[PDB]
Structures are given as C-alpha cells and as structure tokens.
Model the fold of this input.
Amino acid sequence: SYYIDADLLREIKQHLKQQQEGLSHLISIIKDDLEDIKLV
Amino acid sequence: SYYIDADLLREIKQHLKQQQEGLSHLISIIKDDLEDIKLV
Amino acid sequence: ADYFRILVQQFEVQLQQYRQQIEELENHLATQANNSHITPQDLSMAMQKIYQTFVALAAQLQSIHENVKVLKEQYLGYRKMFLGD
Amino acid sequence: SAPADYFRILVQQFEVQLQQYRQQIEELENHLATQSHITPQDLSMAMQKIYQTFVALAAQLQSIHENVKVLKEQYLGYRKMFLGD
Done:
C-alpha cells in the first residue's frame, strides 16, 4: 500500500484552481472586447 | 462632400466580424480547458 | 492529433480567403479629392495591416494553448509524484 | 474604459495571489511525509515550474488583451480613412 493525505493534495489543488479561475476571468474580458469591436 | 458606399463598407465589416468571432471561439476553448483541468 | 492547432490552421486559411474577398471589393473603391490625399491603395494597405494583427493574434493564441498543454503535463507529473506513481 | 481598468486590476491582484499561494503551497510541501524515491524537494521543484507556467499564461493573456486594443485602433484608423479623414 501507499498512503497519502488527500486533504493536503486537495488543499494544493484548490489553490491552483483559484489561479485557473483568475486566468479564465481575464479571458472573459477579452471575449467581451472581441464582441464589442466594430469596423463601423 | 465626400460620398462613400456604406453597403460596401458593411460587406467588409461582415468579413472582419466573422474573424473576431473565430478568435473568440479559439480563446473560448482555452478558457474551457482552464476550467476543466485539475491537479487531481 | 492536436485539434487546437487544426482549428488555428483553419482560421489562418480563412484569413487568406477573406483577405482575398476583400481585395476584390477594394477594386470598387473610388478615388476622390481630400485633404489627406487618400487613395484606394492606402486603404488596401491599412486593411492588410489589420490582417497582420489577426495573424499575430492567432499565433499568440496557439502559443497560449501550448502552455495550457504544458500545464496539463505538469499537473499529471506532480500528481504521479504525490501519489507515489 | 471600465473593462480595461478592471482587467489591469485583475492582473495586479493575480500577481499578488500567485506570490501568496506560492508560499502557502511551499509550506504545505515541506510537511510532506514521503519515501518510493520522491523527496519533498522533487515536488517543490515541480511546483515551482507550475508557478512559472501560470506567470507565463497571465503575461500571454495580457499581451492578447493589448493586441486586441491595437486591433481596435487599426479598425478606427481604417474607418477614418474610408470616410475621407
């Protein structure tokens, strides 16, 4: 067997997840920019 | 006076608008990937 | 297969095609006298400049996807280490 | 514009978060009971590179944002020219 603390791994995972969400929020703003730009 | 054909300008704009949507599609895939991936 | 790269290549082909469709429309532009000395040729150049930005944007999106791919591999690598392989 | 200001604020806040979380995760790691042949230092190095990928991605997205601003400027430049100004 090989025992590991899943609570600890999950804590690390949650930190990274929040950073992923941050990047995703930036993308959202760029998508809004692309929708709004008009040649005329 | 300076007369221009607005229908012509609209034909051009429609092409560029599609390209903007194409960029948005691509970056949306990137967003979807960042929302889906997980450390575990 | 790398389907993201496939989608970018298709976008890049669309750029080429739409540029050419606009080039056909540029034959319909008319030269009139103006303070700025603008001609259809100037407009064509300004349009191509816009296309070069689209080219840059698509390539940059591909480069971001490549880093998302790296991130996925790094996550899997760390997971394997943490879980004792 | 509000979106452009908010983007800038989000990037600054993201950088702060990266710094903070980097330390919080590093402290979680040195408290790992291991050995298999994976040392806490192996995990730490791997995590460091993950952090580097996040920093890269944020910078790349900022550049995309800036290039979309350029695209808009070029649109406006073209429109102005098309309208004889």
